[PDB]
Structures are given as C-alpha cells and as structure tokens.
C-alpha cells in the first residue's frame, strides 16, 4: 500500500490535513433547555459530525486499502469514541466545560438536564483535564484518533496484518514526535504508555454513552437521524 511508504512527518502532515471542521450548533441561547431539546441539540451535532468523520476516515492512511465492510465495521465500533476524543480535544482550554460547539459550551450542572448524562459529562471532563495535564499536542491527538479508528474494531473482525502494520507505523510516528520534542527514551516510552491508557477510558465512555443513547432512543424523548440509528443498532 501507500500508507507504509509514508515518512513520520509526512504521516503527521496527512493526518493534520484531513482534520474535520469544527461545526456550529443550531443552538439559540435565548431558549432554555428542555431535556428533549438538549438531547436534540447534541444528537443533531453528532449526526453532522458523523458525515465529516466518514470523509475524514477515508483520508486516514491505510483506511481506504481496506474492503468496504471492514471500513463499515471499524467505523461502527469506533464512531462515538472518535466523537468523544474530539470533544475532549476541543475542550482542553476550557477547564470544567465541554465545548460541543463554539456556541455550545456546557458544564456539569447543565448535564443534569438529561438523566444519567452528568455521569458521562464528568468522565469527559476528567479526560479533558488529563490531556491538559499532559499538555497533549495536536500532532499526538490526530495519531490517537487514527489509532482508535483502526484498533477499536480489529478484534471484532491479511486484513489484520495490514491494519497492524499501519498501527505500528503510527506508533513510530508518536515516538518520532516525542523524540523531536526533546524527550529521553524513558520519557518517550512512558508518554506513549500514558497516551494509550487514555484510550481504555475513552472506550469506557463510549460504551456508557452508547447505552445512554439506546436508552433515550427507547424512551422516545427525541428521535434521532437514521444514520445515528444505524450506528446505534450496530451496538
């Protein structure tokens, strides 16, 4: 394939080049939030982000080389993980707040508008505080997000040998970035480990948020888009 030939800096440039846009909400700050309204806002935002994520996934080096259903499978298992790590990344410079959209900045208490949502908010906030504590770099963020796409569904499947080879290359890219930043080898291994352990918690937030969405889907507080229902019934 072509992804294996990429150098380290060319890998970072490609990932940074494919970054999806930051979308604005349909939010009106004159209106107060009903539980159905805030859920409709969040799910509407997540639906529009999914369209850009699908196009972002196609530019992730090595992802197009996969067969169609393997691409479908990886996106179906990792879509909420990718949305959440992006939300956590956007919210790094807003302590105690979640920047869903530049015009939609929410805190803990507003998460209580929805049943069981404040539990998800606190995990997302705690993840954002960890990135800010580690001072995550954008070059490291795009690598982690590509790791989520390729790793989260690989064991739920030659196709794996290609994915694992691309994953090894992203690992080399992460190490190459940390070596450029002046980190010693011990610091490189530790930071690489610290970053990868975050993904365990991101999987946990996605699983809980996946069950919170399926709950709100059955209670019919607000309907969601058909694309969002397709991903939701994959879980």
């Amino acid at each position: 394939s072509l992804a294996l030939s990429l150098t380290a800096d060319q890998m970072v440039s490609a990932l940074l080049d494919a970054e999806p846009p930051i979308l604005y909400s349909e939010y009106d700050p004159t209106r107060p939030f009903s539980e159905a309204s805030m859920m409709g806002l969040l799910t509407n935002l997540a639906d529009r982000e999914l369209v850009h994520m699908i196009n972002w996934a196609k530019r992730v080096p090595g992802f197009v080389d996969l067969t169609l259903h393997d691409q479908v499978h990886l996106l179906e298992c990792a879509w909420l993980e990718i949305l959440m790590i992006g939300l956590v990344w956007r919210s790094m410079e807003h302590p105690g707040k979640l920047l869903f959209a530049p015009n939609l900045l929410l805190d803990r208490n507003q998460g209580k508008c929805v049943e069981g949502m404040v539990e998800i908010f606190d995990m997302l906030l705690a993840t954002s505080s960890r990135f800010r504590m580690m001072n995550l770099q954008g070059e490291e963020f795009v690598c982690l997000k590509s790791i989520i796409l390729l790793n989260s569904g690989v064991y739920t499947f030659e196709e794996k040998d290609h994915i694992h080879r691309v994953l090894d290359k992203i690992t080399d890219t992460l190490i190459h970035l940390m070596a450029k930043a002046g980190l010693t080898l011990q610091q490189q291994h530790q930071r690489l480990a610290q970053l990868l352990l975050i993904l365990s918690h991101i999987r946990h937030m996605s699983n809980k948020g996946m069950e919170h969405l399926y709950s709100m889907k059955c209670k019919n507080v607000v309907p969601l888009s058909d694309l969002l229902l397709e991903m939701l019934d994959a879980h």
Binding site: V51, I54, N55, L68, H69, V72, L75, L227
Partner: peptide, 9 residues
C-alpha cells in the same frame, strides 16, 4: 446501510 452509501461516495 447509510454508512456503506456514504463510504462508497
């Protein structure tokens, strides 16, 4: 699937 459609083009 919609996802298959958006992935196709």
């Amino acid at each position: 699937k919609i996802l298959h459609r958006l992935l196709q083009d």
